């Protein structure tokens, strides 16, 4: 890797697409799907949407590159559906590391 971290192990937050149907076929699925994601640390990287952005892209990649060592079955829906929960799991992380630094 480099100088990536590993964010708190939290829990899940859900994410809805078109029907109550594609959120539960997620989230009962959801067995190998992440809860904490990798970034940078707070240093100057981080942002708003660059942090975002990369954090997804980082974690999708460290949920494909392994993915590729044990013949797993991931499709563009599947992935998809992973990017959209890893942006609010990143987005909810900075906001405990936003309301941890600013409580300072």
Known sequence: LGGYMLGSAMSRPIIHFGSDYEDRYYRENMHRYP?????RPMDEYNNQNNFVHDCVNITIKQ????????????????????????????????????QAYYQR
């Open 35 to 39: 809860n904490q994601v990798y970034y």
């Open 63 to 98: 949920h494909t590159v392994t993915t590729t060592t044990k013949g797993e079955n991931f499709t563009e829906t599947d992935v998809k559906m992973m990017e959209r929960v890893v942006e609010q799991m990143c987005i909810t992380q900075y906001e405990r590391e936003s």
